Structure formats: structure tokens, C-alpha cells
Amino acid sequence: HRPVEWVQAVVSRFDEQLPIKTGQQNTHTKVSTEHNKECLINISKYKFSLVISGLTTILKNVNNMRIFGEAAEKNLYLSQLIILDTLEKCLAGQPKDTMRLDETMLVKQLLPEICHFLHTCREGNQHAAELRNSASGVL
Amino acid sequence: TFWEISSQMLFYICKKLTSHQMLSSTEILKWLREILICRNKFLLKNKQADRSSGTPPICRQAQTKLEVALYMFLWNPDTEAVLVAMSCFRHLCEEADIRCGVDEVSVHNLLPNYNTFMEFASVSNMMSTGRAALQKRVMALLRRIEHPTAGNTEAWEDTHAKWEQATKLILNYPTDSLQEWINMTGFLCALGGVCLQADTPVSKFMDRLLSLMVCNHEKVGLQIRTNVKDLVGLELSPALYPMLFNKLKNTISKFFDSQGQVLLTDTNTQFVEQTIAIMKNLLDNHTEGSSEHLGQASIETMMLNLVRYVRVLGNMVHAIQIKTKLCQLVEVMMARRDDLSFCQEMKFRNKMVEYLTDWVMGTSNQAADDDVKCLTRDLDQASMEAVVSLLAGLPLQPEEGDGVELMEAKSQLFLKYFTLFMNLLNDCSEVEMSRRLASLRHCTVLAMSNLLNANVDSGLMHSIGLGYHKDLQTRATFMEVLTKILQQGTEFDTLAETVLADRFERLVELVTMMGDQGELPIAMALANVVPCSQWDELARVLVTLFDSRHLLYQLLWNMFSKEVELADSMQTLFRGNSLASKIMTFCFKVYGATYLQKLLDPLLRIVITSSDWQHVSFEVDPTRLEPSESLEENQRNLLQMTEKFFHAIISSSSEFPPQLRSVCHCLYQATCHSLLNKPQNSIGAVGSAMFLRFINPAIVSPYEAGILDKKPPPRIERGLKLMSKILQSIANHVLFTKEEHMRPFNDFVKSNFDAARRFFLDIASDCPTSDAVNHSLSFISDGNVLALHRLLWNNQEKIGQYLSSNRDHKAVGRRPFDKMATLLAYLGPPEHKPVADTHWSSL
Amino acid sequence: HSLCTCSQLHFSEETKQVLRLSLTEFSLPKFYLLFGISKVKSAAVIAFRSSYRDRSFSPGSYERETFALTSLETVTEALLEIMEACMRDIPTCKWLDQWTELAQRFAFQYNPSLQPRALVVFGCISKRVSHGQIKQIIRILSKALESCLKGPDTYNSQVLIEATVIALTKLQPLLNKDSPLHKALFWVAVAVLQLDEVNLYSAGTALLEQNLHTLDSLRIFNDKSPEEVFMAIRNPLEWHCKQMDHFVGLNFNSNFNFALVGHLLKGYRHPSPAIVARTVRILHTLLTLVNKHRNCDKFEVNTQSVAYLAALLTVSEEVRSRCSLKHRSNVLLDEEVLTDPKIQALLLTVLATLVKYTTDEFDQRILYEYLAEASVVFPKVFPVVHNLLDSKINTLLSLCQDPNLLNPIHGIVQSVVYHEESPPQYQTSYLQSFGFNGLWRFAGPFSKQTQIPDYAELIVKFLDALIDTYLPG
Ligand SMILES: [Zn+2]
């Protein structure tokens, strides 16, 4: 009832601190936003479907948007790098109780986004090199 | 191998950091921080396993080049490096603690500036701010370095050469570099005291600094004059004031040729306009440690030459602006009149009332016929505010050299000033700007009050006609002055003990109020809110007052207890700079000076003059021993002397001053309670502190303490210094180790551990309250009270706020605070201090 | 000045020093403020005018400052002090008896413009009081409430309620040592803290700080507890009281100690800093009397003393140290002693209420640490507190940027989800089951619109019954 809304707030504040999203200095030397990540990671251990399903939609929007300019691109490369690093720790730290209860999500929500990075990418010599390394670890 | 290899690495790298700037310097600094941490851990581990801790010459030659690099980073333009470099200072303190656990004298001997270094680390734990804000904190810390060393003294001289080359490139060749220059200059001004003591490198920094004050450079000239004025006024180290006042004077004395005719040059005007701004800031702020240096030199002859120069500028928009600022400096100079030194104060104050009353011409702006000459109105306001301050308690003196007799000459002089103020008073009538005339008229009536108050005999006749004036507000003021004069006896008349004896009786009873639980709210409140610059005055007044009432123990118990419990330094903290320490210095210096003179005087006469000791030496260092000297002969003589001095001290328990037994007891109780709330012995610390801080300095240097008329011969000087170490060890209850020179005496010191303790027992065994010994003299101490009543008045507002917060359970409707406001208002404002008849002197 | 220099009177030298010192106090800026002429440099200049024979002055600045009955006390007590000093040197002097009679004639008669002031004077210069007089003062308070709610002319009679409470403060210490009213006057202080007005709340506490103080000198709590002393005398008229609890929402028959702290919490919101410190003293004083009955060192944690220790948490340094959170002597939130579900639900509600209104960085830090720690120690009953924490946390999660204030909050979130998925055993309406459904409302900020809560009609009947039970005639 009430606490469900508390989780959304931690999830929502994750979006509005990605560099592509306007940087309003809420990072406060990145200490504040750093704490929000770790709290979000811990919640995954008990609400696995909600946090994960929250992060696919966040990633789905970042990929599917248009930007122009060298400065803007550096942000998009940097923002997606954070999402995958965070998305892997949620999976990695899950208790190994064979919690295989996500059949519906993967087939049409998460995989069609991870497979996107693994395609042989000629957009950048170095940028795509590090992402494909990051997306492989998650897959 | 580790200490030789590790230090050699440090020597090489620490030499490159000071060599010149590099792109990666900030990074090498962070790495260097961690290398020091690792060295500390190994030392701690090694010390536990075996004390051994080798210190080869390379160890000392690399322990020094490190400090020469932690100072020179304090003015780096980058804010990141400077914040790191302050942190590294803490590691030098820790490495000293490990190397020697005796914080009493070992820690403060390896690392003389231990105390201030601990303050560097704390500041670094603060919110990051701009460059300007941080630099104003680095300087304040640098101003507190006391003892010269090889790190202090070489850092100043090393960065001076860099400073002297940056200036040439900025000037000789017609913004990033200008910010580095501004940092270096602030470094040398703040940390110049160490390098002080003709052609010394410090006296050349000052010379170059008084040429930039008049720098006329087409491109950057303006910024140099502005920063130099700011730094030399607000940031200079107080220990350099005597060298400044004496250098500005010798620069202005060349503007007058023979026969005293001024020489306008359009650059002498620029110099004499910066000097006023420098002297106005340097006087208008109170900095700790300036009390003993501000009053060392006189500034009379410089101030007279400043008024006598601007007197000839003329009338203009510029000249009238210089005259206004010169009048505002005099007003500040008369506020600090009790911290300056005068050779003839009465004639100085008389000879400037004469000068400044010539610019007070009224109606000039109306005659000027100019709208821009509204400034000349401000000059009259400035001149009258200055003249009011010069006349407070000033007897009139006619400049001698004329036939007229003294009494008749003073009367003609009073009339001259009186008629001048009356004429100015008439022109401020409403019929003849409603605010400007209100202020100027108020001052003129406050200057005739001061002139008459000090010259009743000389000028009462000329003033009686003020009682029928046309202005009813002037008649009221004149009839309050006549009331004051009547209430004061014409002369002493032996009426001080009767008329005024009971006037302030209620004042002292208020401060000595035994606040419940013995808290003394007024005394404690007075301690907190008084400015630090006035802490010397407060210690004298409080100690003298309470002792006269036979309550000295009560004051001390509330004074030392806080710091001892507040800080683990306990006895160690009473040797810094703080109110609790200054009360200690006063008690030793005033009550104990006579104790030592009657003790060491006969003994020093024997060794210094007696025939038996005509040809003797006290040199027991084989390395320093001369070929003719015999070690056995030297050792026996030195031992016999220590028997004479040590024996005399023990037998002098009965003559120990009563005033000091209370001080010793408080430390005994305060330290005893400190252990209670936490095999250490209370008497151990009291006796050790007493010996090191009271008796040892007298023995080591008897001449500079007034026990002797001329400096002792070098032979006896060495003997006394060695004897001090032997006497100190006995008090500490320790033996000699690591010093083979003194090892043969470890038997003598051991046999005396008992007798010393019995002595400390006698002095420190007095009752916490003097129930056994009591007397009631109740000194009136009139001259001391006036100083107290003057101190309370000036701090009325701050004292009130402090008391209000506490005593919450019982409101302040009738707490001491409410009694103070009623009593202060009843007594009235304090009098004016009379002119000084001597040079400045201190305790 | 005339008393000092009068010849018909022969004052000793000690007395004349007192009069001369008083003559100086009245000229200070403190007393210029009491008389209402602050902003005036000299009073004499304004009193007279030079052109009185020429023209007639035209009054200006019709705005006039309000007069507070607390200022009349300071004036009425500085003048009483002067009179007494003179009466010592005058045998068989009648000054104080005559002044007392004049005060009575106006105190006990209906006059909207003089009765409030006369009542305050009467209680300051009186040396004796009887039951009959203490009866009439309460009957005036009863009627003032009745008239106040009937019509809109409220401020006129809200001052007559303030002066009546002020007088009872000054007269109780003079009552008979064995009168029943020493205890019944406790329920008058409480009934005055329920009217929700800053001036009535400030005067209500002063009658309670001293009521406890007087009862000690008579040694009534020596072998009993405040709950037994005050609840026994309330028994005869419980029927009227049982209806006041229901509307206010604080049951006194369920948990006396938590109900009383439910009234003293609103005192942290008072604008005056000097009244916030007064309510802190009362909390200290009540803690001492309850533990002493148990001989429990004055800081032990138990069912009786848990309520007072929660309130003092954010103000007293000693309480924090003596009762510190376990996961850093004893520790608050002990599950070995705080076993009853009710007593561990009235402790969390107090801790959540304090944060909801607090707006200080330091204060919020200390309280969120205890709530975060309490989430793991009382998982079952914590969800009865979500609403009091819901709104403010939601904002704090988003916009906060303070690591010190952010770590404890995250601890709360991590603990709610982990213990979720279990059916709700205790709901948010658990407190209403046994009365305390008004604890979180009563402690809110004072209302700007000064309106009687409109259940004062019950208080009027309660006082009416009180007089009959203990003052039959
Ligand atoms: Zn001289």
C-alpha cells in the first residue's frame, strides 16, 4: 500500500540523475546519487521482479531517443554504461535459490534490449568496445 | 638497510618538488602522503620488537627537506594541493609521538612546533571554499609559528628568491602569473617573524615592498599597489611592526628639506596617501600577539610629519579627500592610546589640537560657491570628531619660549579655543542640512565639555556666561558639567578613603558573588566575552581583586578545572596562549619573584666571586673536553655545586609564598580528580611542572631575571646549564640513559628521589580551603577597582547575552545579570584615563 | 522620589538605600517597555509641551500597543516590594490591608474593563485565601467559557480566562495544608491546555509547574505515584470526564503516563522560546517522581518511564547517553521489558509525531536513527506508523542531499519490504481501539484562527460538577 510507493521513489530518482537527463547538480559531489544506487541494489534481493522490470523500461527509453552533437553523444554512452553495471549486480547478488520466475519478461522485454549492444558495432572504435564488454557480462 | 634506502628515496623526490612546478605535482603529493603512512607503521612495529630506530645523517638531512616542501605548497595556486599538504603535517606529529612517548619535553623538543601542527590538520577538515577564503586561514596559522628551525628558516629564504624573480618578469617586461605572485607575497608577510634576526634578507623584503607601494606601471600598476596595501596592512606578522614603523618614518623624513620646507612631487603625495591607509588598517584590528610589539616603538614623529605635509596640499576635490582620511586615522590612534608608546604625550596631543583646528573653518562651502564642495562640510565633521578625542583629560600647555608667565599664558590659550567653538556654535543655529547641523552642533558642545573638564582653574571664568545662552539645549549641557565638578574634591583632601570608598563597595560584592555551587557567574561570563587582546588586563584585575577578598582558591578552582578536564593535555596546556595560562604567568611573576631573589642570591655570589671557585670548570663532555681538562676533576666540582643548590631549595619550604601554595594545590586536586574520573602520582606532575616552569629558568639565566647585574662568565654559564638537567631529572623520578656524559651521576639522582618528594608534599599539602590559616585585611585597592568598572562598562551588551542563556530554572528577573544593569546605570560612565608620564611597559 | 525625601517618615539608612536603587530601575529600558513607551528617548519631554498655552495638541498615531497581563505582574510586584520595605519602619502600618480591600471590590464584580486587571493585582498582594474565595474564582472561569462560545465577542472574555488562571497560580501556595483543592486544581490546568490558544496554553503550564512543586513540600508523593494521587480524586465525577476523553482522543483510564505526555507535546510548538523551556522542566520533574516511587535511579527504562524518556530524547544530552541505541548503560527499545503490544505502539507513535513537525536538521537526524533501529526490533507493530511517516519520507527520498540524514532513511525502506508479504496483523486503526486516536493531532501547530474547539461545553459542565463535589458550601 504505502511502502510500494516508497520503492517507486527510489527507482524514479535513478532516472533523473543519468547524465543524458539534465544534470541539475543533485549529485552533490556524487555522494547523494551514489547512496541511491546501493539502496536500490539491496531492494532487489526482496523485490526482484519490480526492480528489474523497472530498469528495462528505464533502459528502453534511453536507447530509443535522438540526440545531436558530440557533447550529447558522450552522455548517452556514459548513461547506458551505468544502467548495465547496475543491472548486473541485481542479477549477481540474487540468492541462488533457483528463483526462475521471470519467463514472461525475458522473451520480449529484456533480451531484445541487451542483444542490441552485442551486434557488431561500427559507430565507434572505443565506445562500442566497452559496452559490448558490459552487455556480455549481463547476458 | 630500510632506513638508509627509504630516506634516500625521500631526499631525491622532495628535492624535485621544490625545484620547479610540474604538471603532475599534485599527484606526486598524494602518493607521498601514503609513503609516510607506511614508514610510520614499520617504525611502530620495529619499536615494539626492539627500541634500538636508526637515525643516520641521511635521516636528518631528509627529515628536513620534507618540511621545506610542505610549507612551499601552502601557497600553490591549486586549492587541491594545499588542502593535501596540510594533512601531511599530521603524520610528522604522529611519527614524533612514536619515537618518544614523553610528551612533556621529548615531543616538544624533537618537533618544536608540535602544537600548531595539530591545528593544521583540523582546518583541512572543513568545507572546501574559494582560494581567497582558504588563504586567509593559512596565513592566520602561519602567523602562529614561534620557534625558528631549519624548515621554517629555509622555506622563507627559498621562496623569497622565487618571489624576487617573478617580480622582475612582471615589471621589467612591459593573470595566472599575477595570482601566484599575490600568494607568495602573503606567504612572506605572514611567516616573516621566524627569519627576524642591517642587511639581513628580511630587511630587504621590506625595502622592496615600499617601492611597489608607489608603483607606476602602465598595464598592471594599479593591482600591485592595491594588493600591497591590503597585505601589508591586514596580514603582516606582528613581530615585524617595529621594523615597519622605523622604515616608514625614515622614508617620510626626506620630504622636508633643510629649514623644514615641504617638497610636493606628485609621488610623495602618492606615498603619503598609502601610508595613511596602511596605518589605518594596521591599527584598527586586534591581532593576537601584537601587544608586546605594537608598544615597542613610537610613531609620534611620523604622525606630526603627516599632518605637516597634507597641511600644504591646498583646496581641491583631491586634497580635501586626503585631509578627511587623515582626521579619521587620528581618531583611531586615540582609541589605541593605551597600547602605544609616547615620549611626550602631553605636548604631542597639544601640538595636534593646534594643527587640526585650522581646517574647521565654517561656512566655506557657502563661500566656495560650488556644489561639488559639499565635501568641505564632511571635513568639518571629521575634524571635530578628532578634536573631541584629543581633548579628553588633556591639560593645556603653552609652547614655551615666550616671556608671558605660565598661569597667564594658559588662560590666553583657553580663551582662544573657547571663542573658536562658540563662533562655530552660533553658525549651527537652525535659523542660520537639518541633519548635518544637528551632528556638528552636538560635537561642538561635546568639545567644550572636555576642554573645561580638565582646566577648571584656568578657564572657569571665561565659561560662566554659558548659563544664559540663547540655545536652551546648550544651557542644559553646561549645567551638567558644573554638577560633576562640584562633586569632585578640589584636591585629594584625603577624601578617597571616605567619599569613594563605599561608592564601589557594591560593585566588588557583585563580581565576587558566590554563585550557587561556587560558579561565579560574573567572573566566568566576563572571561568568555572579553576580546583576546584584552586578556592580559583581565588576568591582572581578576587575580588582584579576588585575592584581596581572600578567595583566590575559588577563582582558580573554576579556572584550571575546565581546561584540565576539557583537554587531556592537563598541565601541558597551561603553557600555550589562553586566559587560564596568563593567570599562571601573573602569579609566578608577581608573587614568586621575591622568593627566588632571596634564595639564589647568596649562592651565586659564592661561585661567581669566591676565591675557592676562581679556577674551576664544569665541562664533563669528553668530546668537548680540552686536553688540559681532567674529567675526574671536572665531575667532582660539578657534583659539589649541585649539592649546594639542591639542598637550599629543600630547606626553603617554610618561606614558600602563600599565594603560590594555592596554585600548587589546585593542580594537585585538579590532577587528582582527573585520575579519579579516568600508578601515576599526582605529586609527580605538580613538582615536575613547578620545577620546569618556575625555578629552572631562573637558575639557567639569572641575569635576564634581575638576580644579577652582569652576565656571568662563560665558564660558570656552562656549569649552571648542566646542573639544571641534573636537578630536573630528580624531580621527574627518572635516571640517565642514552647520554653517557651524565651517566656517572645516575647514582646521585637516584638517592635523591625521596627527599624531593617530601618537599613537594609540604607545599602541596595545604588544605583545599584555608581553614587553618585565615586573616582579614580587606585591602581597599581603589586604583584597581576603576579598571574593573571600566572593563564591565565596555562589554555590557555581550555580558548580558551570555548570562541570559544560563540560569534557566530561576529566571534572570533578579539573577546577577539584573543586578549588574541596575548598578552600572547607578554608577554612570567611567572617567577618562590620564596622560601617560613614562614609556610603555608590561609585566 | 517623594518617599525618599519626606520628613514625616523616619526610614532607617538601610531602607533608604533600597528606595534609591528602585528609583533607578524604573528608568531602565526594561521598564520603559512594561509601561508601553518604548521608542521614546525621554519620558519627561513627551509628557509636557512648550506651547500648551498657545494651541491645543492634536492626537496622532491612533495605533496603540496591546497590554499583556504578564506585564502587569512585573509592575505589580516591583511596587509591592517598595511598599513592604517602608512598612518595616512604620509600626502598625495599614497600607497593605487598605490596598487589599480595594482590589477585592473590583475582582469579584462584573466589569469587562477592570475585572481582569484587578484579579491579577488581587492575587499578587494577598497574604491569605479561604475556600469561599477560591470557589468564586473558579465560578468566574466557568462563566467566561460559556459566554465565549455563545457570541463572536471572544477576545473580550478570553482575557478573563487568562487572569483567572494567573490568579490561581499565585493563591494556591497559601491554601490550607489539608484542603482537597490542592489535587483538584490539577484537572483545571489540563482542561486549560485543551483550548488551543497560545496565551491560554502559556498560562496553563504555569499553574501545573507550581502545582507539582507545592504538592512536594506537603510530601504527598512520598509513598504514592502521580497516577494514583490524581486519578483517585477524579473518580467521584468520572462520568463527566469519560466524555471529555472521547472527543479529545486521549484516554486517561488506559495509560495515564502516555495521556499526560500527549498534552505536553504541543509545547514544543509554542512561539515563545521561554515557554518551550518551561515544558521541558515539567517533563524532567514528572520523570523523577515516577521512578522514585520505584527506586529506579531516575533514568531506568520501564513501562511507566518510557513515555517521558521518549519526549526528552531530542533535548537532553544525558538521556541520549544513558539511553543509547543498541547498534551503535542500558538502551531504549528493550524487548525484554517492553513486551505489551500496546506499550510498544504508543512509543512509536510518539517518535513519529515529533519528526512530522520538527524542522531542524540536527533534530531529524537523531529521531530517524531510533525509528530505523525500531523497524527491525518491532516488525509486527511498525506498520501502525506508516501514515505518520508516509508524506515526509517521500519528499526526503527525492530531494535530500545530506549523507548523514540519508543513511537512516534508507534503513527504514529496506526493512519494510523485507518484513512485508505477511498479512497485516495490526492496522493503522489499532490505536483507536483503546482511545489514543488523537495523539498525533493534538500535538500539531497552533491554529492561527483562534476558535474555541466547540467541545468547551463539556468543560463547563465538568467544572460545574467539580465545585459541587469538593466545595458543597
Ligand atoms: Zn623616549
From Swiss-Prot, chain A:
Could you tell me what this protein is called?
Answer: Neurofibromin truncated
From which lineage does this chain's organism come? Answer: Eukaryota, Metazoa, Chordata, Craniata, Vertebrata
- Gene designation per UniProt: NF1
Q: Which residues of the full protein are shown?
A: 4 to 142 of 2839
